[PDB]
Design a binder for this molecule. Structure first.
Ligand SMILES: *[C@@H]1O[C@H](CO)[C@@H](O[C@@H]2O[C@H](CO)[C@@H](O)[C@H](O)[C@H]2NC(C)=O)[C@H](O)[C@H]1NC(C)=O
Ligand SMILES: *[C@@H]1O[C@H](CO)[C@@H](O[C@@H]2O[C@H](CO)[C@@H](O)[C@H](O)[C@H]2NC(C)=O)[C@H](O)[C@H]1NC(C)=O
Ligand SMILES: OC[C@@H]1[C@H](O)[C@H](O)[C@@H](O)CN1C(=S)Nc1ccc(F)cc1
Ligand SMILES: OC[C@@H]1[C@H](O)[C@H](O)[C@@H](O)CN1C(=S)Nc1ccc(F)cc1
Ligand SMILES: *[C@@H]1O[C@H](CO)[C@@H](O)[C@H](O)[C@H]1NC(C)=O
Ligand SMILES: *[C@@H]1O[C@H](CO)[C@@H](O)[C@H](O)[C@H]1NC(C)=O
Ligand SMILES: *[C@@H]1O[C@H](CO)[C@@H](O)[C@H](O)[C@H]1NC(C)=O
Ligand SMILES: *[C@@H]1O[C@H](CO)[C@@H](O)[C@H](O)[C@H]1NC(C)=O
Lengths: 390, 391
């Protein structure tokens, strides 16, 4: 999408995985989807160094809407849970120097049964812009035909442009299209800033593996299309929650950087361990994710329960990720000739290699003739940055 | 098996899950199966408070053997990886007040291809006794028929007894019997101190869920059989490794306490987080596992991605574990009438409830009519102790 936005992968916070569709504000007032929840995350994004790290978009997922549209056919925030309205919430978020994302659906309903946008693409777009909304996540539930889906995503895309406001456009277009016919990613990129490719993430190592396995399997179809203004979206970061070990959290951070993925955290900033905070705020790794070149990484090789991924960076630098998919035993040794890395120009005639994850450690100079040797924890990942000696 | 041993569930350290069958001592000297590894593990069990916590048995799994037997038909430790021999290693372990476990197989190979014990049950048992071995893990690989399997496990049990030495007898008998016919646990309890029921654990939340789900599915078949001298073995503790989140580590510890399981750690004591160490050394939770009554717990109820487990303790006390199997979202509220806990006698007429996991917190007095209210993390477990009392 050529609207000048998402020149690097969008970074921010999205409530869905951690808070879902909690409407019980009476017995769980602190976890329910409400204006208060987003106010609290906004404050901590500022005060706990999240904004300084690049996390800029505070996004509302499903279940913010009133059950019905007002008398003039426009969408409504829930009168009890969002009593000051979305525009006033956007004003607050902007006052702290952040941007606001919101959620709508191409179909007749959102996935949680709330009013869909089909038949209202223009008024909804103008409504969002008038509210001061800076991002739109547009879901694909309750849509009958393939044609209405494609027409709807396109219609909304043009509708946003014509508002005149800069609004990052998030699509789930290919996800709802895949089980029927293969997507045109050139067409999708044309209308969308990012696009969800695969099933919802949750708080598990199983989910992460499924995403990595689907991406590497379909990479000849999705890697090259990605670039400034249009990214593949393998869904939210779930680091800082309950279902991932430290090494599995490391694997998600490393690989979502390799994949040039949007970094939308879905966690509770009010309750997050120092360990998870430092990982999510790792400047060197975020910088890899945010590389100006914007070329998505890919899976180099795969065998012996090992995976090697690499991503070309600006200034002849490369990022390399080695995963240990063996879920038994201890740290396993993996060795690769550095000449096989970076299509053969990363370490020619030499390169300096720096480990970034799980810990930052200079490994030194590697000659064109050299072999990189590493021990990787089960379900963990080693992330390296390679600087060519020229 | 009443040989006077395993009156409470055996506690110790077993190398298999973390180190497996690493034989490459030249390129992986820190992970290979060698006398030095067990020597150093022995030192740390003492110095890092593991022995004081109850972890008493240092156990060698598969891949300690030389490729074949000596001139006298006896088993040999590998001359390169165990150059000082098992006897001197047992002497070393005993000097630190610990006990040594070793591994053999009913068939005529171990699972990793090293010399098996079929045809050598007596000499192998006597060999172990002469070496000073205090525990035997007896595997069931490369065994053809049901009767050779059953006879082999029986024979070794008697072969060990006739040595006169106290040796905890750990069997994998029922696990290797499942693919033929369902096991007779009465016969098994007669010959074994504990027994492996299900497939090997590994370093994952999937394996733990898989072990819990089969245990509760088969619990009316295996729970009552458990007691002093004979326990169900749902395999090693993998807390302290790489594949479990903190809440999943809590879940294993809590439920291995509930199940009255042997607590065999499989980790690297040289490299373990303070957090995993404190959990593994939790006296209150260990005490539940080691409860003198020796009655195995069970799954009370199950629904809405929740599980409730409970275990009757000595002195009219109960341990209660609540699991959240939902792997998305946040902490979930769960509420239960305390009269439904401990078969209605735990809080009769009242009980004092103390939370042990994820953190220790006194909850106070609950009368028979009252309701227990709790929040459980995804894939986590809340562990409670209920003490019957009058107030
Ligand atoms: C609407 O779309 C047009 C293009 O279709 C956007 O104009 C582009 O803006 C970028 C940076 O602002 C320029 O580098 C491109 O050259 C422009 N393209 C054309 C064809 O003019 C415009 O920014 C979009 N408007 C909004 C509000 O997003
Ligand atoms: C060999 O088996 C016998 C038979 O059970 C064991 O003898 C029992 O020992 C326990 C405690 O030591 C006593 O309470 C039982 O009364 C004994 N039974 C009989 C029939 O005497 C004996 O301990 C075993 N010996 C070894 C070395 O395992
Ligand atoms: O509401 C839809 C739901 C969530 O609320 C979030 O908005 C998104 O993360 C995605 N989402 C859903 S159902 N995605 C989805 C759509 C189709 C499918 F086959 C599997 C998953
Ligand atoms: O070598 C065998 C292996 C280990 O080394 C240990 O001895 C034990 O933890 C068990 N073990 C094996 S393969 N156990 C096993 C796992 C699944 C199965 F269907 C039958 C047996
Ligand atoms: C919305 O519902 C109407 C009425 O059933 C239907 O005709 C229309 O096709 C639906 N739109 C989509 C996009 O599914
Ligand atoms: C897909 O990309 C663009 C988008 O409309 C289109 O021009 C192109 O012809 C399409 N290619 C195929 C093979 O459909
Ligand atoms: C052990 O060896 C003998 C002879 O090779 C054979 O009869 C038997 O099946 C083997 N395996 C067993 C007993 O599990
Ligand atoms: C199982 O227990 C003993 C073990 O020898 C045996 O005598 C008994 O008959 C068996 N029970 C059944 C129901 O087969």
């Amino acid at each position: 999408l050529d609207n000048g936005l998402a020149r690097t992968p969008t970074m921010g916070w999205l409530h869905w995985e951690r808070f879902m569709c909690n409407l019980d504000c009476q017995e769980e007032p602190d976890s329910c989807i409400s204006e208060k929840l987003f106010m609290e995350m906004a404050e901590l994004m500022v005060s706990e160094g999240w904004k300084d790290a690049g996390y800029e978009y505070l996004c509302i997922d499903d279940c913010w809407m009133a059950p019905q549209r007002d008398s003039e056919g426009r969408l409504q925030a829930d009168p009890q849970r969002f009593p000051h309205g979305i525009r006033q919430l956007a004003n607050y978020v902007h006052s702290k120097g952040l941007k606001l994302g919101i959620y709508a659906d191409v179909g007749n309903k959102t996935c949680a049964g709330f009013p869909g946008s089909f038949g209202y693409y223009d008024i909804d777009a103008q409504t969002f812009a008038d509210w001061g909304v800076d991002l739109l996540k547009f879901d694909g539930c309750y849509c009958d035909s393939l044609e209405n889906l494609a027409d709807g995503y396109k219609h909304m895309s043009l509708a946003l442009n014509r508002t005149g406001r800069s609004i990052v456009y998030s699509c789930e277009w290919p996800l709802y299209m895949w089980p029927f016919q293969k997507p045109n990613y050139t067409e999708i990129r044309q209308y969308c800033n990012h696009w969800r490719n695969f099933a919802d993430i949750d708080d598990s190592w199983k989910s992460i593996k499924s995403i990595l396995d689907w991406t590497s399997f379909n990479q000849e179809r999705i890697v090259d299309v990605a670039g400034p203004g249009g990214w593949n979206d393998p869904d939210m970061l779930v680091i800082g929650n309950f279902g991932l070990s430290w090494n599995q959290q490391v694997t998600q951070m490393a690989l979502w950087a390799i994949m040039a993925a949007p970094l939308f955290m879905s966690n509770d900033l009010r309750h997050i361990s120092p360990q998870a905070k430092a990982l999510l705020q790792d400047k060197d790794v975020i910088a890899i994710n945010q590389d100006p070149l914007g070329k998505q990484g890919y899976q180099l090789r795969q065998g012996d329960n090992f995976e090697v991924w690499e991503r070309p960076l600006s200034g002849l630098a490369w990022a390399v990720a080695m995963i240990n998919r063996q879920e038994i035993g201890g740290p396993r040794s993996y060795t690769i000739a550095v000449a096989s890395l970076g299509k053969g120009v990363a370490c020619n005639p030499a390169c300096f290699i720096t480990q970034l994850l799980p810990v930052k450690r200079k490994l030194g100079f590697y000659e064109w003739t050299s072999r990189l040797r590493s021990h990787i924890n089960p379900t963990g990942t080693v992330l390296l940055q390679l600087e060519n000696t020229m």
